Amino acid sequence: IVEGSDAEIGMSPWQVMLFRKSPQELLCGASLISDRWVLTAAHCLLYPPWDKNFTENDLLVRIGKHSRTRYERNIEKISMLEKIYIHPRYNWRENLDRDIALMKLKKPVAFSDYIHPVCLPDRETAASLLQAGYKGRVTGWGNLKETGQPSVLQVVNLPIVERPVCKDSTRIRITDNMFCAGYKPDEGKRGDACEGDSGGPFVMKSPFNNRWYQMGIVSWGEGCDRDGKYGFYTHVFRLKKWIQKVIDQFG
Amino acid sequence: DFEEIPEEYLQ
Amino acid sequence: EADCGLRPLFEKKSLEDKTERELLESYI
Ligand SMILES: NCc1ccc(CNC(=O)[C@@H]2CCCN2C(=O)[C@H](N)Cc2ccccc2)cc1
Ligand SMILES: *[C@@H]1O[C@H](CO)[C@@H](O)[C@H](O)[C@H]1NC(C)=O
Ligand code: NA
Ligand code: NA
Numbered sequence: 001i002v003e004g005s006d007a008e009i010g011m012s013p014w015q016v017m018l019f020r021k022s023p024q025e026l027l028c029g030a031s032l033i034s035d036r037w038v039l040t041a042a043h044c045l046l047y048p049p050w051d052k053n054f055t056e057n058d059l060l061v062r063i064g065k066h067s068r069t070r071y072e073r074n075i076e077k078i079s080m081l082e083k084i085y086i087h088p089r090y091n092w093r094e095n096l097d098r099d100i101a102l103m104k105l106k107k108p109v110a111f112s113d114y115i116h117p118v119c120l121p122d123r124e125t126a127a128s129l130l131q132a133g134y135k136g137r138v139t140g141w142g143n144l145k146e147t148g149q150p151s152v153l154q155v156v157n158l159p160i161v162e163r164p165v166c167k168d169s170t171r172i173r174i175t176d177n178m179f180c181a182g183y184k185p186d187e188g189k190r191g192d193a194c195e196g197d198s199g200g201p202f203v204m205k206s207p208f209n210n211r212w213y214q215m216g217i218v219s220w221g222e223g224c225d226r227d228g229k230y231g232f233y234t235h236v237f238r239l240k241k242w243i244q245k246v247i248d249q250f251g
Numbered sequence: 252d253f254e255e256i257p258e259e260y261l262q
Numbered sequence: 263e264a265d266c267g268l269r270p271l272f273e274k275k276s277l278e279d280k281t282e283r284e285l286l287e288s289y290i
Contacts, residue, residue: 005281008271008279008280009271010269010270010271010272011269011271011272011279013269013270013271019256021261024252024253024255024256025252025253026253033266034263060256060260062256069252069253069254070254071254071255071256071257078256078257078260080260112270113270113271114270116265116266116268116269116270117263117265117266117267118266118267119266119267120266129289133288133290134285134288134289134290135284135285135288136285137281137285155281157281157284157285159288204285205282205285205286206267207286207289210268210273211266211267211268211273212266212267212268212269213267
């Protein structure tokens, strides 16, 4: 996260760290959506251009974390993966269309002050809140600058951007399964996701029921915090029927 | 880098 | 689930975090 701040304790209790077993290193962010299911970006697990194709046994998820590098004894919980599910139409060849994946945990995680699931949006909450200028919140342990790494989880609030501005900012083909967010050059304020924040959540607090909803997943961009560039996020609601199909069938 | 995690989680 | 999106250390205690108001002010 570039130009963010340190998270408060318990501020993002759905945050998940995807962690490689060997070498032990951070792979991506992710989010807790129930006691057994974690949501992330497909490119965190499968990206053939970079020779990335992880299997369940390669990975752990670490839940309840604040510090990036510490083992947070009596606070974080570490879970093994039962199964990875990648969207069947995830487009790793072109533009990361449908950049979404689910991970089922081997055992349910116990909720605590530090571990709690985020809601997924319904159609009406998405329609109300996914509007240009409305702000969401992005969290992660990724890089602090494009070209280092944080002691603790970072947080930044960013406005959703009008679709024509998103389209006009890049040569990559945008789809309805994406939205973009960030400040414009003339808005002065700054902030962005960066490499290592992949797969983490873009959340909004509904003003109707005072609950947090995950509207996006950190997906792609060009550089970090560049003027005139915006971060792109997987549109969770647009892909929710697939999420529900997977959870109903498997779970 | 990262603090070693308990061996139980590494199988 | 029934309790999703309500944080133990914030909503469940009626405590706000330091920047959530910035989000609310943008929902116009
Ligand atoms: N600061 C926003 C941001 C947010 C999130 C990230 C992390 N995401 C990536 O690194 C992806 C993975 C494959 C490659 N990516 C990219 O973004 C590429 N620069 C562009 C690309 C390439 C192929 C297909 C689609 C897009 C980076 C910057
Ligand atoms: C990813 O790896 C699995 C083996 O675990 C393989 O079956 C699958 O075809 C691979 N996917 C791609 C796109 O290479
Ligand atoms: Na209300
Ligand atoms: Na920018």
